[PDB]
Amino acid sequence: HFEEGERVLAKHSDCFYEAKVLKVEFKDNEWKYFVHYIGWNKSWDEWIRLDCLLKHS
């Protein structure tokens, strides 16, 4: 699990991008994370699932 404001790696297409978690939600027995991709337009902000997130380090 991840927290609001946490720096994470987020998978988009084929690879992982530096990202920040903006919002956390739980619905239909699953966690979703609204992320912002660091150094990218706000327009790319999106909801992603747990299996597309990676902790740093």
Author numbering: 51 to 107
Copy out sentences from the published article reporting this entry, exactly as the authors wrote them:
H3K4me3 (residues 1–9) and H3K36me3 (residues 31–41) exhibited detectable binding to MRG2 chromodomain (residues 41–123) (Kd values: 0.8 mM for H3K4me3; 0.69 mM for H3K36me3). To obtain the information regarding the specific MRG2 residues that are important for recognition of the histone marks H3K4me3 and H3K36me3, we determined the co-crystal structure of MRG2 and the methylated H3 peptides. The proteolyzed samples were analyzed using mass spectrometry (MS) analysis to determine the protein sequence, resulting in the identification of a region containing the chromodomain with residues 53–123 of MRG2 as suitable for crystallization. MRG2 complexes with the H3K4me3 and H3K36me3 peptides were obtained, but the complexes with the H3K27me3 and H3K9me3 peptides could not form crystals under the same conditions, consistent with the ITC results. The crystals of MRG2 with H3K4me3 or H3K36me3 were diffracted to 1.68 and 1.65 Å, respectively. In both structures, the MRG2 chromodomain contains mainly four beta-strands. However, the predicted alpha-helix located at the C-terminus is missing in the electron density map. The tri-methylated lysine projects into the aromatic cage formed by the His62, Tyr67, Tyr87, Trp90, and Trp94 residues of the MRG2 chromodomain. The co-crystal structures clearly indicate that the chromodomain of MRG2 can directly bind to tri-methylated H3K4 and H3K36, and provide strong evidence that the aromatic cage of the MRG2 chromodomain and the associated residues are essential for the binding, the same as other chromodomain proteins. Consistent with the structure, the Tyr87Ala (Y87A) mutation in MRG2 disrupted its association with H3K4me3 and H3K36me3 peptides, supporting the idea that the hydrophobic pocket formed by the aromatic residues is essential for the binding, as with other chromodomain proteins.
MRG1 and MRG2 belong to the MRG protein family, with highly conserved members in fungi, plants, and animals. Members in this group have the same domain organization, with a chromodomain (chromatin organization modifier domain) near the N-terminus, and a MRG domain near the C-terminus. Firstly, via their chromodomain, MRG1/2 proteins act as readers that recognize methylated H3K4 and H3K36. In addition, MRG1/2 proteins bind to chromatin that contains tri-methylated H3K4 and H3K36 via their chromodomains, the bound MRG1/2 in turn stabilize the binding of CO and ultimately controls the activation of FT transcription.
